[model samples]
Target: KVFGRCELAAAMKRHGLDNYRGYSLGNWVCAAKFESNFNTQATNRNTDGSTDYGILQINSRWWCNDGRTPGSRNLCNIPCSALLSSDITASVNCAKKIVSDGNGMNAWVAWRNRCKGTDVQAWIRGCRL
Candidate 1:
């Protein structure tokens, strides 16, 4: 379940994220590395009583429905399980939508705490792309 970071970087690029808002692909790659360690099936329960799903760790609070979480807006119109797949199309697309909503990469606590203001490019340093 440990997808290669380089592979993810390429997929995210194909997902139209060459530059997300003002963030770089490295920023997203860095955050994903911290968020899920590139595991497609990763899920983490939050202190706020919600769950984060998949590589981008999209929150169940609004973007996805975990079926048990109340008040899940499911703004991405996808079930949380939809993100737990080797194919990250739904996850990447949902992340793009979330960034469009204003939080940008700040939506991911990992990004805010780890990649922000750092040399994010190091995350993809050896990637052929």
Candidate 2:
């Protein structure tokens, strides 16, 4: 398992993801927290029949192609299948590209629903990446 919030921050740090596209490290860390509970392998099937992939849960209906999901723009140019792994390299890369387009952290529903405007400092606590 990927464990807790601290490890999530460390993983993102190891990926050299402190802050990109004007988002805080807290946003990134909190995204993983509420999105997938820091589980890189987490995937969720939405009520709309779209699937969310990986920690940030990039949707197959738009950003990435899950193959099974038809008509995905694949804007990230990466497969949603690749996002299923624990490595998170492909997932994070695609997620970054999404938010970089001036979309900000609003691209993630989890961020909108939970992480936004919250003091996510506790998410990094002792990990302090």
Candidate 3:
């Protein structure tokens, strides 16, 4: 399912993404904007045989056990299936794990190029923060 801007912003905030790791809720919301356009089932396969999944576009190489990635780390111990749903709890938790690993929001190039240092408050406008 595709999320409306405020809907996604509110969901992310409820999932504890509001300044969870020095990055604002807007930062994450903006990343989702460019990464998956707020689509729950978004997927992108990389040339390295790994794939990105979900609204946050978490990767299969390290975060999920796709059972297809050659050297999948499965750090999040989550199935790729969990990432492709409207329930973003697993995806958000895994995202926290990803940031806690020291990668920061820079792990997502979409965030790096489109959200970093960029004003993202508009993404959450009318969502009442």
Best by TM-score: 3
Off by over 4 Å in 3: 101-103
Candidate 1 has an lDDT of 0.86
lDDT of 3 by residue, 1-129 (tens): 899888988998999999887777998899998999999899999999999999999999899989999967998898998999999999899999989843589999999999887787777888887
lDDT of 2: 0.78
lDDT of each: 0.86, 0.78, 0.89
TM-score of each: 0.92, 0.88, 0.95
State the lDDT at 76 in candidate 1: 91
Q: lDDT tens digits, residues 1-129, model 2?
A: 464777778877777667676666778888888888887778899877789878887888888877777665888898788887877789778877787654578988888888887887667788746
**Rank ordering of all candidates by TM-score, starting from the highest:** 3, 1, 2
The lowest-lDDT stretch of 10 consecutive residues in candidate 2 is 15-24
In angstroms, what RMSD does candidate 1 have relative to the true structure?
Answer: 1.5
lDDT of 1 by residue, 1-129 (tens): 578989899888888776778777898899999999989899989877899899988989999888877766899999999999888889988998899844578888889999999998887788966
Model 3: what TM-score?
0.95
